[PDB]
Amino acid sequence: SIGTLKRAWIPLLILVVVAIAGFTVQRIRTF
Amino acid sequence: SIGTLKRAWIPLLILVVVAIAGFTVQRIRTF
Amino acid sequence: ARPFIPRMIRTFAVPIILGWLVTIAVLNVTVPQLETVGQIQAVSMSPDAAPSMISMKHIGKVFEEGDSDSAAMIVLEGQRPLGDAAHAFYDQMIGRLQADTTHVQSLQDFWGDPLTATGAQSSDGKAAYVQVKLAGNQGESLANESVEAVKTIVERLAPPPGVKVYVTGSAALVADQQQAGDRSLQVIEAVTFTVIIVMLLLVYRSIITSAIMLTMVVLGLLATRGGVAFLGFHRIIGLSTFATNLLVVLAIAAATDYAIFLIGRYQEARGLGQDRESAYYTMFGGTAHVVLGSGLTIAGATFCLSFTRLPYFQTLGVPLAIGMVIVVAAALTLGPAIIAVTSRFGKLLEPKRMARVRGWRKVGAAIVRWPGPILVGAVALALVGLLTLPGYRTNYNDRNYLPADLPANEGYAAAERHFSQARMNPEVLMVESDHDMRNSADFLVINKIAKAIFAVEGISRVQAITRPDGKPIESFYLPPEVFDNPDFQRGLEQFLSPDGHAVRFIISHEGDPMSQAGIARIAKIKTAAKEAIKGTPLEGSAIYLGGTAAMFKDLSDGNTYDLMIAGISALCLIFIIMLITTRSVVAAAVIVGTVVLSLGASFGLSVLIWQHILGIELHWLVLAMAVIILLAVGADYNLLLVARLKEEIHAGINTGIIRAMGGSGSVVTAAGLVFAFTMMSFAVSELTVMAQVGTTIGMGLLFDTLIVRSFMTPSIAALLGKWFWWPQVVRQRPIPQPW
Amino acid sequence: TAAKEAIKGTPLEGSAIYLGGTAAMFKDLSDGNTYDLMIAGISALCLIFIIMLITTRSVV
């Protein structure tokens, strides 16, 4: 909903950033 | 006169655009 | 008073409806379908002026082997090394193959002769192949029935036990690709029809309005199909399977855009609070010129697409132009007539639960007050899209975009188990000089040419008269008395010209010969041959190179030049139609820049999704179809949005932005989501090319509709303010009236 | 590459080519250096973004 998304936007954004970062790092370590 | 240049500025501008477009397309066509 | 054209269409509505129905019925009864007239009137896919096609015709003419470039191969493999039963089967099979004349013209019998048998056999001996040159150019029907005839001739007899036979080659590939595209249009069509019906039930929230809108699209599609089939059947214009595929997909696109435009404008007009007749007249007066201008500029761009130098695009422009004229005529006459007759029949088309309008006015209020930061965010997402664009590669091999159940694919798998090379797709290099080539020193020169071609990085085998097996790694000498042994004479007719004025080499690559490296190898091959003939008395000859990779390099060069030509023509026509519509040069420049930036960002995002995450490269037809369809639809929605913005500016520019957004952005995004998800549901296809094209168009148009057209063009408009309409003198806001 | 095109056609086609020394070691270290600098830069910049986001509660 709106309230639970705008209430906890901070842990969601850290979660999304670390998710993309982990995906990219796991991609580069294959090289 | 300046009246013939400021009353037909849209057709003259379109004519210049089509002229340069046809020149460039005919130039690339022979490559 | 009241305009004349909508009154004329309104009063005579049901004669127009019945006449359109009768015309559609006649064109779809007395004229056969579009796939059949595309099949019987196909064209070649390579230019006649392309150097590869000229070289292939010249090779066919000198050696007297026909006037066709199509070829296939017959492969025999066994679980044991092949014996005399395989020899008897091979001799009988080539006898019955040489019996056929009207389908097959040439057959390169290599395994029959024991000199070239070592060049026509596997290292372990459990495989053999023969090349047969058929009738008809590639992309034609004649090659397809030649492939069918040769494969049923091969399959007609029972092979000896332990030995199996398959058909391979590029002609087998294109025949099986046509068969696969024929038989893979049932279940993906099922999921496409159900996603269309759920999307229309989501957008319109009614079962009646969706029914009328589907009637509009299907009637326009049938009218366009019948008209193009009529003009093509009586040999007035030309057709192709590619032309009919792109024509039908762009026809569905344009028809659903125009239907959604007319219905949305009518429903908004009735939601304003006026009765059903002036609602019809105001929706006509609002969007009729919009549809007219949009359809004519798409028709002009697709007609200017015909001024190019590639057969994939020359044969497409006139059918697209004519089909778009029928689409515009249908959406202008049949559309409003059936809207009127379903309006006055009773209570059919009703506005109910109008909540998209208020939300889009909220979005407009957000974009007006803070144009700066929202523009920075939209440009940040655009730069997220753009940075992966410079890294982008392509593949031309069509085997790895097809299901593995095709007989050509299992023949390829059987060939790959015993051959370490790409022996199924060879290349032919002919050198033509002005004197007789049956001489010892000239044979030394031929060996020098073969050795020089062999040393190119990536070339695995070269077969010449000097070294038939493919290992020119020794010093060579040849005494002149070899011209009396009849087996060497058979080899001489196999390799040299019958008149002795041309020599040919058969070249087999390494790995994938249709990759980018395989494209780049052939220029080095020609250069190596050219410096091989320097200093000899053979200096000054004509060097011809033919094969699959030569054709694909020719097509890629033509593709990039043709992309530049069509891009310049399309952007100039877009600038012109914006210049008529707005009477503003800065607004036209803004719109053209937004279109080109949006196209680049969308194609970059598609490349990021497919090449980097999923791990498989893109095609090049995907780039071509994507840029054509997205250019057309983006011109359409941009013209409608800018025309609605121009329509009300007298009561302020910021109020103009919010009112134009709340009146047009909902219609534009409804059409965008409907067509984007309709093209998106092609991703379940087992055909990789059409899945790539469908999802590239889907995600590109989703990015276009959700970010660029909703948050970037209104931001630039509100940021530039009253300098968005230069040269015209417009106020930022009107004179402040009293309360 | 010169060795690989030298063994072509001859019956040692498909052999194994092994190359070692100081220069080979340094080429492997340099390639690993550029990929690992990319990895370390990504991780460090993401963590700096995280700590600035908790401290100030603002993304700009």
Side-chain angles (χ1 to χ4, degrees):
Chain A
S1 66
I2 300 299
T4 187
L5 273 193
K6 294 212 210 283
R7 183 260 281 180
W9 82 261
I10 308 189
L12 276 160
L13 178 47
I14 283 91
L15 182 63
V16 173
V17 174
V18 69
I20 306 149
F23 195 108
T24 315
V25 173
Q26 211 154 38
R27 192 146 281 274
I28 314 184
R29 294 182 68 250
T30 302
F31 293 163
Chain B
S1 50
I2 196 66
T4 188
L5 214 65
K6 283 194 201 303
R7 285 164 83 186
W9 70 269
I10 296 170
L12 199 62
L13 176 46
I14 294 169
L15 163 65
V16 174
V17 173
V18 186
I20 193 66
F23 174 52
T24 58
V25 173
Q26 184 183 300
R27 173 68 49 80
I28 314 164
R29 254 181 60 90
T30 190
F31 288 150
Chain C
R2 176 159 333 263
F4 173 70
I5 297 170
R7 204 151 70 72
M8 163 264 266
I9 297 170
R10 164 162 190 73
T11 289
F12 286 150
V14 293
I16 296 169
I17 293 177
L18 267 297
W20 265 108
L21 261 184
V22 173
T23 310
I24 293 169
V26 175
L27 300 154
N28 294 115
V29 165
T30 63
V31 176
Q33 283 264 299
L34 279 72
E35 58 196 330
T36 63
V37 299
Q39 202 214 51
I40 63 171
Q41 209 184 345
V43 298
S44 179
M45 296 297 172
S46 178
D48 291 331
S52 66
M53 189 67 203
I54 289 148
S55 295
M56 211 75 252
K57 291 183 183 293
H58 206 306
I59 287 155
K61 284 175 68 176
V62 173
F63 287 87
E64 303 310 340
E65 305 276 43
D67 61 357
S68 178
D69 65 26
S70 172
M73 297 215 186
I74 303 299
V75 62
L76 300 160
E77 64 277 14
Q79 273 75 81
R80 274 172 321 260
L82 311 173
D84 274 25
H87 294 105
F89 187 26
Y90 180 73
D91 279 294
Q92 203 254 351
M93 175 41 52
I94 64 170
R96 313 214 285 180
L97 271 192
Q98 265 183 40
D100 189 340
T101 301
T102 187
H103 294 90
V104 298
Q105 40 260 58
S106 179
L107 172 140
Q108 304 214 270
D109 166 39
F110 273 130
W111 201 16
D113 202 303
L115 292 176
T116 61
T118 186
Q121 207 204 1
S122 180
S123 46
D124 48 26
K126 293 183 220 63
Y129 62 88
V130 65
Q131 165 151 50
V132 54
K133 273 180 279 144
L134 323 182
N137 293 132
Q138 302 214 240
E140 291 290 4
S141 68
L142 183 62
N144 293 13
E145 288 94 10
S146 277
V147 166
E148 301 304 326
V150 65
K151 68 184 289 184
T152 188
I153 282 183
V154 173
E155 158 189 16
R156 202 170 43 170
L157 188 148
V163 175
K164 274 173 55 36
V165 64
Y166 287 101
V167 297
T168 61
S170 296
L173 260 174
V174 65
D176 273 301
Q177 170 164 347
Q178 197 295 335
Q179 153 84 10
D182 186 74
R183 65 150 150 100
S184 279
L185 282 183
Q186 283 264 320
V187 296
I188 63 170
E189 300 305 318
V191 64
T192 297
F193 282 55
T194 188
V195 69
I196 293 169
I197 194 66
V198 68
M199 276 277 101
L200 280 54
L201 270 295
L202 197 41
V203 162
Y204 274 104
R205 265 209 271 287
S206 179
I207 195 66
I208 282 152
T209 63
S210 178
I212 286 92
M213 190 291 264
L214 289 173
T215 299
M216 287 204 217
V217 188
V218 68
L219 281 184
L221 185 46
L222 292 175
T224 301
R225 270 180 98 79
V228 175
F230 185 104
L231 273 296
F233 180 54
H234 293 325
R235 312 309 290 279
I236 297 169
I237 62 171
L239 290 164
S240 290
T241 61
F242 194 13
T244 45
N245 290 320
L246 263 191
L247 196 167
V248 65
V249 64
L250 169 59
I252 303 148
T256 189
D257 297 308
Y258 298 150
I260 283 159
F261 285 5
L262 274 295
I263 297 170
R265 185 69 142 120
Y266 177 70
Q267 292 179 356
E268 194 270 4
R270 183 174 175 179
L272 290 203
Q274 63 184 177
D275 62 357
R276 294 179 181 177
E277 310 83 357
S278 47
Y280 172 60
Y281 274 119
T282 58
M283 61 87 81
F284 196 108
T287 192
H289 72 87
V290 180
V291 174
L292 173 45
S294 296
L296 269 293
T297 188
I298 305 174
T302 51
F303 178 51
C304 282
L305 183 44
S306 85
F307 286 124
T308 64
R309 303 291 301 305
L310 202 73
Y312 287 90
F313 283 137
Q314 262 184 20
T315 62
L316 169 59
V318 192
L320 290 176
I322 297 170
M324 285 284 323
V325 183
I326 285 93
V327 173
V328 178
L332 272 193
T333 62
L334 194 170
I338 65 177
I339 294 169
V341 69
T342 61
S343 195
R344 197 50 37 76
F345 182 75
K347 183 276 191 202
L348 279 295
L349 283 172
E350 184 210 2
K352 175 54 171 83
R353 178 131 179 270
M354 213 71 95
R356 281 208 189 197
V357 175
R358 296 338 305 170
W360 278 95
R361 299 280 289 287
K362 285 202 181 63
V363 171
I367 182 64
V368 167
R369 171 83 97 181
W370 302 288
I374 302 192
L375 175 46
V376 186
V379 174
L381 281 173
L383 270 294
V384 160
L386 292 174
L387 265 292
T388 187
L389 183 62
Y392 152 77
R393 305 289 202 220
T394 42
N395 218 7
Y396 304 108
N397 184 349
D398 214 348
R399 182 261 181 271
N400 45 28
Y401 302 101
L402 283 173
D405 57 27
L406 317 186
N409 280 282
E410 59 207 358
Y412 264 122
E416 286 167 35
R417 279 182 289 220
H418 295 88
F419 284 129
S420 62
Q421 296 111 141
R423 278 220 207 203
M424 299 296 115
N425 292 38
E427 314 275 343
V428 177
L429 188 150
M430 192 182 35
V431 166
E432 183 178 1
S433 181
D434 62 357
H435 64 316
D436 204 38
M437 291 182 183
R438 284 142 210 150
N439 208 337
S440 277
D442 182 6
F443 260 60
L444 295 174
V445 176
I446 310 184
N447 176 64
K448 191 178 309 313
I449 305 191
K451 215 172 191 223
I453 297 169
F454 185 44
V456 165
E457 273 165 50
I459 300 300
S460 180
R461 303 292 161 182
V462 304
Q463 290 146 95
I465 178 61
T466 300
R467 185 81 41 160
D469 55 88
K471 287 145 181 85
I473 60 171
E474 294 294 328
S475 179
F476 181 74
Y477 89 102
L478 192 53
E481 69 269 13
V482 298
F483 293 140
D484 63 358
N485 291 318
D487 168 34
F488 183 77
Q489 259 53 51
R490 166 56 183 297
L492 274 195
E493 319 286 319
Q494 193 44 69
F495 278 119
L496 292 175
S497 188
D499 59 43
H501 275 196
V503 64
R504 64 160 151 191
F505 314 90
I506 297 92
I507 298 168
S508 277
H509 288 188
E510 268 204 357
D512 200 2
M514 272 86 77
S515 88
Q516 303 253 220
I519 294 306
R521 290 175 183 174
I522 60 171
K524 305 151 71 193
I525 297 173
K526 291 174 71 175
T527 301
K530 187 179 289 293
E531 282 104 14
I533 63 171
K534 288 172 70 176
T536 62
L538 201 165
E539 161 196 60
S541 294
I543 288 144
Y544 295 99
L545 184 64
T548 301
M551 156 180 164
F552 273 130
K553 165 161 201 43
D554 276 16
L555 292 174
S556 62
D557 292 357
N559 171 56
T560 194
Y561 292 136
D562 190 351
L563 278 185
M564 291 185 286
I565 278 177
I568 295 170
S569 294
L571 299 154
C572 276
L573 271 295
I574 294 169
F575 185 105
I576 283 158
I577 181 64
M578 299 277 138
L579 192 43
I580 285 93
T581 300
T582 65
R583 293 153 279 220
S584 177
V585 63
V586 61
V590 159
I591 288 304
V592 173
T594 299
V595 172
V596 63
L597 165 73
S598 158
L599 282 194
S602 295
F603 177 79
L605 161 73
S606 183
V607 165
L608 164 81
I609 288 285
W610 274 93
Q611 180 188 30
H612 285 332
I613 292 180
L614 266 63
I616 53 179
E617 280 146 310
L618 267 182
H619 214 177
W620 60 275
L621 299 201
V622 61
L623 163 56
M625 309 197 212
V627 66
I628 294 179
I629 300 299
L630 297 163
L631 262 170
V633 298
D636 177 16
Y637 323 117
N638 269 325
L639 192 153
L640 165 65
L641 162 73
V642 175
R644 187 36 184 289
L645 182 61
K646 170 42 165 54
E647 162 159 315
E648 186 275 345
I649 295 298
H650 54 286
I653 298 194
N654 289 351
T655 302
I657 285 296
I658 63 170
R659 285 213 199 123
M661 277 303 251
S664 159
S666 66
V667 166
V668 174
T669 191
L673 307 183
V674 161
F675 175 69
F677 282 128
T678 294
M679 294 295 309
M680 191 95 78
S681 66
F682 282 7
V684 307
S685 178
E686 64 184 1
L687 285 182
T688 319
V689 190
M690 90 172 272
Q692 273 178 354
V693 175
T695 188
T696 297
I697 281 152
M699 59 183 107
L701 192 150
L702 258 187
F703 180 76
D704 277 31
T705 301
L706 282 183
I707 300 299
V708 162
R709 193 151 317 114
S710 296
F711 293 140
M712 201 195 277
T713 288
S715 85
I716 294 193
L719 192 73
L720 277 71
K722 69 181 179 67
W723 291 90
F724 193 61
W725 320 81
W726 194 83
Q728 323 274 310
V729 176
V730 65
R731 284 179 99 197
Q732 163 84 10
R733 65 173 51 73
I735 189 166
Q737 73 154 300
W739 301 87
Chain D
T1 300
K4 189 207 173 82
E5 319 286 329
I7 48 155
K8 215 168 68 189
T10 47
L12 322 177
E13 171 146 0
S15 295
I17 291 281
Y18 294 109
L19 173 83
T22 59
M25 185 180 289
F26 274 127
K27 165 149 211 312
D28 289 314
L29 272 54
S30 56
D31 293 331
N33 201 305
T34 187
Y35 303 121
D36 293 332
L37 279 183
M38 185 176 177
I39 297 169
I42 294 169
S43 65
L45 272 296
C46 291
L47 266 172
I48 297 163
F49 181 76
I50 285 148
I51 185 59
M52 295 285 155
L53 205 172
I54 284 92
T55 299
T56 74
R57 313 171 60 64
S58 66
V59 58
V60 176

